[PDB]
Design a protein around this nucleic acid. Structure first.
Length: 601
DNA sequence: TGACTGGTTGGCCACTCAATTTGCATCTATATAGATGCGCATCTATAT
């Protein structure tokens, strides 16, 4: 449901320079608090096993750095911004590492389980029919299915008769009469080996890096490498890998996770202003287009409404949720605080705009807070329960807000969206009780006046990829791509799909479980290419470049998110299902929506 | 007393095969104009 809106902040130099000095000084303990985990912390491998960072460890590394002679000059809210960012860095990276570990194991199982029909006969000492009969018994026992069969191979080895359980699993949890081609099986088993290899490589990841602004390592390395002689090829390359590294120009943003830690006001000139907790001397002026101003007026109205009411209304329902203050990169020459541009990005929960939507968040938080208090039931823990119960009481007192009746769709009408390489979207609206398609749309309809933009995107990707190649050979800085055009097209389709869902009173939009299509294609094309260029690895990589590149450029996750966002701002439910391997783009969309309807029970 | 601040859970070449075009040689079975030979009319001559 959340959105991010933005404004540039304007102030006189003294204020934009003082804030830069604090952020160039704050950017450094964001580096030192990474290193205090990256190599200093002894428990680190226990966290990599569990997949989660302990909720207090970054604060317990930061608390003694608050008096460090290098870091002591900063407000209490700038240290909380440091702790926030470093918590979110590790809390992300450990959660990436854990899903990779789980995938590697979850296929190391399957590379053991996957056997040819002849190997099952040898391993069982029995007929492939005896295996078909035992596979029929195992389905009769089971009737969670695929997991239950995996568990019944992980348990219940059963005098190697788990051979028949692998026979079900390789057949997609079904009986098969046909006996398989050993060349097709060799390609299949090789794809798993490739996925296993690729996972054992990706299992090791570069320990998350800090944004060093100082150039000190680079300058020290330059004067070392030019005046001294390396003792090894490894040392001479270690200096090369440092000297090639581009250094950052921007400090990490400030994060203000409490909405009240931004204070709003109106300037004499009638313009809006803002100030931050601990920087309450530095008034900043808001500059934003009238297409976004209504939120910045709402910020000040939410604040005035609470202050006019003796704090009896809660910022648990303030339209602003959190702010990220960032320096966007400028152009040309000048001091960093005169060259770059302070920009304030406000997280906003869009459903807090209206009274009917605010009531949803009131019920959502009142249920979550009630459960929290009953799960809790020590000294400061009682003070925390005072924060919570003052919220649980205050959240019932309403802000005066715009009214708009909630959208309601028919529980039987669904929009199916089918994504692919040639057709980025294609739509079928199904009445699932009639089994009747109400409408279909192809791309030429689904973004209408804008259909020239798909042809533009394909021209621009091809044109600009060649210009980047020509530019790199000359060391030109000019490096451009179609990324913002692809982002616009994915947003045009997201608006049109939801406008169509509203038009037909659909209860939900259905999006495919595409999963990691990029890795799957990379393994399939490799297992095939190894049969056509054996030993010539450069020829294996050249086999289907344009197909592999087009799959790595395929924006399916960004279109899926663009539709999710616009649907949840409108109130339409999102649902999911398996996308058919065969059929036209329409048939894919039709069967996808009907499948998601069948999954209701 | 209402402000401030602090808290905190595929490509380049070499080789092969079906085909399918084009040309030439060899029947072949009919169509068609010129010798050749009776079969009678017609004229001439000869005799009682």
């Amino acid at each position: 449901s959340q959105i991010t809106i933005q404004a540039r902040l304007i102030s006189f130099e003294s204020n934009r320079q003082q804030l830069w000095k604090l952020m160039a000084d704050l950017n450094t303990p964001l580096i030192n608090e990474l290193l205090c985990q990256l190599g200093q912390h002894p428990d680190f491998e226990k966290w990599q096993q569990k997949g989660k960072l302990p909720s207090t460890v970054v604060s317990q590394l930061c608390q003694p750095l608050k008096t460090d002679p290098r870091f002591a000059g900063q407000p209490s809210r700038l240290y909380m911004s440091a702790i926030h960012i470093v918590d979110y860095i590790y809390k992300s990276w450990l959660a990436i590492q854990k899903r990779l570990q789980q995938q590697l194991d979850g296929k190391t199982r399957w590379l053991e389980m996957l056997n040819s029909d002849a190997e099952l006969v040898e391993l069982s000492g029995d007929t492939l029919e005896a295996i078909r009969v035992k596979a029929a018994e195992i389905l009769a026992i089971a009737m969670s299915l695929s997991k239950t069969l995996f568990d019944a191979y992980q348990e219940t080895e059963d005098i190697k008769s788990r051979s028949a359980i692998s026979y079900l699993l390789k057949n997609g949890c079904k009986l098969t009469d046909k006996e398989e081609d050993s060349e097709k099986f060799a390609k299949r088993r090789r794809q798993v080996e490739i996925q296993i290899q690729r996972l054992t490589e990706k299992l090791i990841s570069r320990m998350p890096k800090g944004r060093d602004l100082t150039n000190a390592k680079w300058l020290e390395t330059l004067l070392t490498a030019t005046t001294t002689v390396a003792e090894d090829n490894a040392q001479a390359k270690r200096w090369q890998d440092i000297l090639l590294t581009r250094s950052s120009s921007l400090p990490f943003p400030l994060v203000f996770e409490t909405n009240e830690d931004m204070v709003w006001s109106k300037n004499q000139k009638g313009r809006l202003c803002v100030h931050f907790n601990g920087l309450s001397d530095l008034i900043f002026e808001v500059y934003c287009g009238n297409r976004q101003l209504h939120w910045f007026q709402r910020f000040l109205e939410d604040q005035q409404t609470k202050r006019k009411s003796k704090n009896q209304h809660s910022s648990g329902l303030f339209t602003l949720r959190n702010g990220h203050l960032v320096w966007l990169e400028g152009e040309g020459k000048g001091e960093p605080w005169n060259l770059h541009h302070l920009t304030l990005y406000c997280c906003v929960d869009n459903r807090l705009w209206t009274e009917e939507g605010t009531e949803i968040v009131r019920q959502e938080k009142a249920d979550e807070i009630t459960k929290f208090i009953t799960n809790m039931k020590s000294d400061t823990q009682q003070a925390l329960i005072q924060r919570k119960q003052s919220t649980l009481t205050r959240i019932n007192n309403s802000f005066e807000r715009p009214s708009q009746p909630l959208y309601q769709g028919q529980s039987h009408i669904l929009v199916g969206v089918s994504l692919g390489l040639e057709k980025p979207a294609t739509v079928a609206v199904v009445d699932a009780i009639a089994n009747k398609v109400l409408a279909y749309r192809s791309i030429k309809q689904l973004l209408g006046d804008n259909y020239e933009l798909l042809n533009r995107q394909r021209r621009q990707q091809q044109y600009l990829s060649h210009e980047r190649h020509k530019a790199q050979k000359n060391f030109s800085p000019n490096q451009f791509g179609a990324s913002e055009l692809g982002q616009h097209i994915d947003r045009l389709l997201a608006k049109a799909i939801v406008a169509l869902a509203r038009t037909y009173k659909a209860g939900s939009i259905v999006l495919p479980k595409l999963g990691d299509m990029r890795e799957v294609v990379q393994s399939e094309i490799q297992a095939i290419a190894e049969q056509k260029f054996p030993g010539y690895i450069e020829g294996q990589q050249k086999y289907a470049k344009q197909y592999r590149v087009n799959v790595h450029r395929w924006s399916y996750g960004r279109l899926i998110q663009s539709i999710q966002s616009k649907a949840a701002q409108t109130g339409i439910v999102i649902e999911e299902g398996k996308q058919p391997i065969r059929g036209s783009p329409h048939d894919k969309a039709k069967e996808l929506a009907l499948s998601a309807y069948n999954l209701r029970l």
